[PDB]
Design a protein around this ligand. Structure first.
Ligand SMILES: *[C@@H]1O[C@H](CO)[C@@H](O[C@@H]2O[C@H](CO)[C@@H](O[C@@H]3O[C@H](CO[C@H]4O[C@H](CO)[C@@H](O)[C@H](O[C@H]5O[C@H](CO)[C@@H](O)[C@H](O)[C@@H]5O[C@H]5O[C@H](CO)[C@@H](O)[C@H](O)[C@@H]5O)[C@@H]4O)[C@@H](O)[C@H](O[C@H]4O[C@H](CO)[C@@H](O)[C@H](O)[C@@H]4O[C@H]4O[C@H](CO)[C@@H](O)[C@H](O)[C@@H]4O)[C@@H]3O)[C@H](O)[C@H]2NC(C)=O)[C@H](O)[C@H]1NC(C)=O
Ligand SMILES: COCC(=O)N1CCC(c2ccc3ncn(CC(=O)N(C)Cc4ccc(C#N)c(Cl)c4)c(=O)c3c2)CC1
Ligand SMILES: [Ca+2]
Ligand SMILES: [Ca+2]
Ligand code: NA
Ligand code: NA
Ligand SMILES: [Zn+2]
Length: 805
């Protein structure tokens, strides 16, 4: 109930929202149908349009007009945005030369440069180049300020998850807005873009920028807008708030545009109809910049021009139907479209089996345009599992395609030609970032980066301490002229032990055998030096990783590799080795096929054992440092130490052996040497964070050997590939992966073929950031380099995407 019989007189676009049953006058009242009776009349004036003309100059004020051209308008803060241009001989902002903003040039009373965030829905990254001839204002912001060639959205690449990620610096799994459409099984409620349900605060987690600012005494309202408020009126409202008294005026502002997304869904990303919406958005930026220039704020404010996601070509006829795969299609509920999410129709149904649904959807048609996953099996880079609103069954849909339950869902609603929501590494889903103002750099291009990083930067821009979030604070310092945050390396929590030779062979009863008894002071001191760390500078190029939790571990040195060996998990946490361009690949000798050797530095009680692998009919083993890459037949014995062994399913060993025997050498050839760090990951509760010992759900049968959920590698070389990896003087280049440790290769439809036809494709799908591995391991990498810490943080957030240009 609303008593709509109050008034908006003197209250138009008020900042403090007033509580029902009293009527409202704020920018959201229309969405709630709760505006006062006279809101349209007083707050949504339209008379005489949005622009001054020559005949209107110095007019007598008429309060009915949409905006004003009278002499008093500048002091009232309510001129039309072109007033100085038409009536005072001023130039439009876009026609002015660009001039470096070295210091903020603000009116008296401004405590700090305001921040204006201009967000555009569906603004695909390539629009910046392809539409540049029709977007002169946007082109000036881009060429004069700081810009990236593209910005990576979060998955799913939908509106509400991405806009709220921009506001919070959190993954959708953490902020709770996991789709444009969501069902919560605990609320027994569905969230849609259309409807009142989305108004309930129970959906919205984390701490958005407006709340962060308000808590710290910086004034800021929410970033939402009612759709029916026209763009010209949103801009005039922002400019009027900027003319408020010092004690009343906000420091952060948000404009939102529904375009170009709206027309993109109808016409496709590059439909001829798309030129006009891009023109109209550019005109709106022009209105803002002209308005700022009138108020002498155009060299004071920091402006961020930012998109939520791009747009792909998608039509009705490119739809896969679940009724073509399943027979029981009426026992499921599907969230459809550019992603699929599947749950049971009824919770009273104990005859609902996710296993049988997955099997009936796996590699069933040769051209199949989607792939089913249990959520914990999705690529870890998506960070899309740790929330009750994310269904156990997920469908990853090919770009350009849709999934639907039954044909009747599609014709009983071709309409549309565009859509979005696909994997966030897809080129068509990439969006835009431009920063312009005193605090951003001048005429500067930055590498592509993830939208999760922006919350920290906006906090820096406003002098705020960020709430805990998923950005890496310092990784975007290169965007800023000043206000840089000074990041520092986390302190190491556990110091390693360095064990010497402490155990005789006969103390071990591991059930292992090796043909190694086949037997010089020249070469005995030599190998003693190797065991002491003489080759360590070759194989550990960036220092040892720091362990950021409490644990018991040993450093083990060898000719060809170094490791950090966990006495708790009975295997390395990390294994580090360098392979030059000139390195040679060899075989495992016949006599060494089943060789496993006790390590006389490590107790029998803290070792794995061969008998457990013999008894476990499902589980086999592999090695972290590959025997194929030994530097000599004598060094090869080190690779068969029990302390280099890890548990591996035979299906996974096909993947791992191909990576070790073929791909490491190929990368060494291409990149002029590589340094590799490899290791296990345990994430049984799919939270993206390292498991404690008591979270492990699976062991090698009848032992205390824990089974990893994933295996990682981090592959580093010189950015200047004319220098070898082990003698690099400048910036680094990295690619990394987090491969799921699965007992089948059901994910790869071509797995019955030779590894050369499917393994590398799998690895590409499971590409990762160094920072993702750090979360999953409690390790901190690149501790000892010649590079600045901010640069290393940028390197740790890099993702190698394997898309074209
Ligand atoms: C990305 O960045 C984010 C942000 O930094 C990282 O997420 C953080 O992870 C922390 C570790 O998991 C976690 O800290 C825990 O917080 C518990 C208190 O939780 C509430 O308070 C916070 C702070 O105000 C709030 O933000 C939380 O909000 C969540 O929940 C509501 C719904 O209730 C949502 O609206 C919101 O979207 C958000 O949901 C997300 O998080 C929850 C987990 O909290 C998930 O379940 C959701 O699916 C969703 O992802 C909460 O309202 C606190 O209780 C924890 O402490 C326990 O654990 C320690 C172990 O050290 C133990 O010593 C304590 O005793 C304690 O145990 C008690 O609780 C147990 C569980 O019920 C119980 O078994 C015991 O008996 C004890 O009573 C813990 O400190 C933090 O909340 C989140 N924050 C957010 C915002 O998500 C994220 O990890 C990053 N991702 C990556 C990959 O790096
Ligand atoms: C976290 O706080 C939640 C909260 O304050 N509320 C819950 C939500 C509640 C509410 C009330 C009325 C509304 N009217 C229109 N739209 C559309 C709308 O603005 N865009 C499409 C643009 C937009 C801009 C910023 C963000 C962010 N970030 C997002 Cl996601 C969307 C609402 O989304 C909307 C939301 C307002 C109260
Ligand atoms: Ca959108
Ligand atoms: Ca975990
Ligand atoms: Na076995
Ligand atoms: Na297969
Ligand atoms: Zn859309």
């Amino acid at each position: 109930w609303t008593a709509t019989s109050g008034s908006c007189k003197g209250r138009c676009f008020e900042l403090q929202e007033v509580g029902p049953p009293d009527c409202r006058c704020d920018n959201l009242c229309k969405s709630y149908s709760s505006c006062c009776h006279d809101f349209d009349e007083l707050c949504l004036k339209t008379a005489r349009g949005w622009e001054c003309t020559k005949d209107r100059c110095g007019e007598v004020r008429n309060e009915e007009n949409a905006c004003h051209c009278s002499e008093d308008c500048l002091s009232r803060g309510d001129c039309c945005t072109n007033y100085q241009v038409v009536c005072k001989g001023e130039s439009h902002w876009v026609d002015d030369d660009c001039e470096e903003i070295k210091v903020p040039e603000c009116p008296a009373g401004f405590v700090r440069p305001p921040l204006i965030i201009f967000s555009v829905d569906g603004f695909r990254a390539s629009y910046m180049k392809k539409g540049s001839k029709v977007m002169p204002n946007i082109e000036k912001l881009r060429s004069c300020g700081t810009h990236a060639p593209y910005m990576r959205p979060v998955y799913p690449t939908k509106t509400f998850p991405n806009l709220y990620t921009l506001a919070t610096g959190l993954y959708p799994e953490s902020h709770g807005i996991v789709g444009n459409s969501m069902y919560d099984p605990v609320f027994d409620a569905s969230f849609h873009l259309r409807g009142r349900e989305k108004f309930n605060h129970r959906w919205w987690g984390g701490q958005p920028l407006w709340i962060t600012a308000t808590k710290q005494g910086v004034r800021a309202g929410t970033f939402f807008w009612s759709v029916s408020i026209p763009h010209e009126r949103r801009i005039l409202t922002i400019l009027q708030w900027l003319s408020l008294p010092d004690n009343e005026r906000p420091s952060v502002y948000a404009f939102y545009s529904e375009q170009p997304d709206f027309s993109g869904h109808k016409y496709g990303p590059f439909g001829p109809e798309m030129t006009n919406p891009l023109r109209e958005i550019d005109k709106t930026v022009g209105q803002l910049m002209d308005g700022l220039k009138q108020l002498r704020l155009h060299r004071c404010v920091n402006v961020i021009f930012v998109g939520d996601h791009g747009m792909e070509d998608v039509t009705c006829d490119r739809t896969e139907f679940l009724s073509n795969y399943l027979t029981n299609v009426d026992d499921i509920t599907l969230v459809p479209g550019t992603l699929g999410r599947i749950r049971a129709k009824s919770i009273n149904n104990s005859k609902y089996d996710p296993k049988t649904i997955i099997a009936a959807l796996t590699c069933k048609k040769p051209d199949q345009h989607f792939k089913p996953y249990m959520k914990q099996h999705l690529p870890k880079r998506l960070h899309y599992a740790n929330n009750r609103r994310i269904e156990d069954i997920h469908l990853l849909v090919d770009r350009r395609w849709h999934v639907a339950r039954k044909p009747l869902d599609v014709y009983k609603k071709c309409f549309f030609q565009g859509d979005h929501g696909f994997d966030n590494k897809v080129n068509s889903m990439q969006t835009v970032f431009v920063g312009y103002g005193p605090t951003f750099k001048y005429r500067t291009k930055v590498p592509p980066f993830e939208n999760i990083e922006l919350y920290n930067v906006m906090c820096d821009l406003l002098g705020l301490k960020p709430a805990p979030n998923n950005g890496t604070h310092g990784s975007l310092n290169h965007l800023l002229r000043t206000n840089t945050f000074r990041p520092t390396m986390p302190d190491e929590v556990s110091r390693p032990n360095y064990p010497g030779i402490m155990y005789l062979q006969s103390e071990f009863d591991l059930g292992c055998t090796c043909d190694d008894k086949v037997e010089n002071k020249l070469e005995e001191l030599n190998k003693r030096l190797h065991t002491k760390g003489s080759t360590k500078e070759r194989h550990l190029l960036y220092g040892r990783p720091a362990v950021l939790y409490r644990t018991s571990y040993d450093i083990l040195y060898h000719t060809d590799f170094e490791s950090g060996y966990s006495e708790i998990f009975l295997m390395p946490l990390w294994t580090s080795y360098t392979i030059s361009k000139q390195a040679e690949v060899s075989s495992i000798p016949e006599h060494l096929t089943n060789c496993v050797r006790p390590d006389v530095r490590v107790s029998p009680g803290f070792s794995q054992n061969c008998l457990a692998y013999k008894n476990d009919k499902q589980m086999s083993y592999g090695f972290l440092f590959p025997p194929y890459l030994s530097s000599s037949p004598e060094a090869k014995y080190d690779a068969f130490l029990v302390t280099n062994m890890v548990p591996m399913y035979p299906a996974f060993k096909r993947v791992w052996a191909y990576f070790q025997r073929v791909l490491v050498k190929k990368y060494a050839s291409e990149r002029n040497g590589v340094n590799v760090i490899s290791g296990p990951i345990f994430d049984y509760n799919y939270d993206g964070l390292r498991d404690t010992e008591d979270e492990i759900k699976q062991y090698v049968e009848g032992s205390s050997i824990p089974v990893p959920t994933h295996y990682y590698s981090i592959i580093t070389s010189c950015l200047d590939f004319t220098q070898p990896a082990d003698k690099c003087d400048g910036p680094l280049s990295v690619s990394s992966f987090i491969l799921p440790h699965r007992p089948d290769n059901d994910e790869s439809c071509n797995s019955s073929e030779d590894e050369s036809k499917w393994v590398e494709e799998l690895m590409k799908m499971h590409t990762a950031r160094v920072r993702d591995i750090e979360h999953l391991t409690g390790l901190d990498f690149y501790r000892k380099t010649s590079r600045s810490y901010s640069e290393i943080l940028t390197l740790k957030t890099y993702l190698h995407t394997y898309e074209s240009e």
